[PDB]
Design a protein around this nucleic acid. Structure first.
Length: 105
DNA sequence: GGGTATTCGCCGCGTACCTCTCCTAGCCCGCAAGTATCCTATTCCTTGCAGCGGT
């Protein structure tokens, strides 16, 4: 793909066991430089993201034994239109129940 | 007045480490050093006044 998001109509028809000629290598070079610059900027930003996050939740500390309530949320497997992207057994593994479940009996 | 749009200005943008260099400008006044000049001698000549033999 060329810099501005377009896809070149002529692909690179040469692997690395054989040799890339000049132009093919040029295009690959552009792609690699885009990747490198993106990693640099992306990590720079992610650092700021995490620093913001840890400074809004730093004061929270589990500090009791049981609040004694009954409200929860309905955990269900996630569906996107297609298959199950995440089953139920991996979304409630290790979270206490709110209202005892009744089997489908 | 009043609800709205548009503009202006402030706030923010990763961690840790290693190597190197450079850090005010300009005036001014004492002051050391180096020098050209001015007064200091010697040798020649021609005057002006005080002693002084001589009679």
């Amino acid at each position: 793909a060329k810099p501005d998001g377009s896809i070149i109509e002529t692909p690179i028809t040469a692997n690395f066991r054989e040799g890339l000629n000049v132009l093919q290598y040029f295009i690959s070079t552009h792609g690699a430089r885009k990747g490198l610059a993106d990693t640099a900027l992306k990590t720079a930003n992610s650092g700021y993201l995490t620093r913001r996050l840890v400074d809004v939740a730093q004061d929270l500390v589990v500090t009791e034994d049981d609040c004694g309530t009954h409200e929860g949320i309905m955990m269900t497997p996630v569906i996107e239109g297609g298959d199950v992207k995440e089953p139920l057994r991996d979304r409630v593994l290790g979270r206490v129940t709110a209202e005892d479940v009744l089997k489908p009996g």
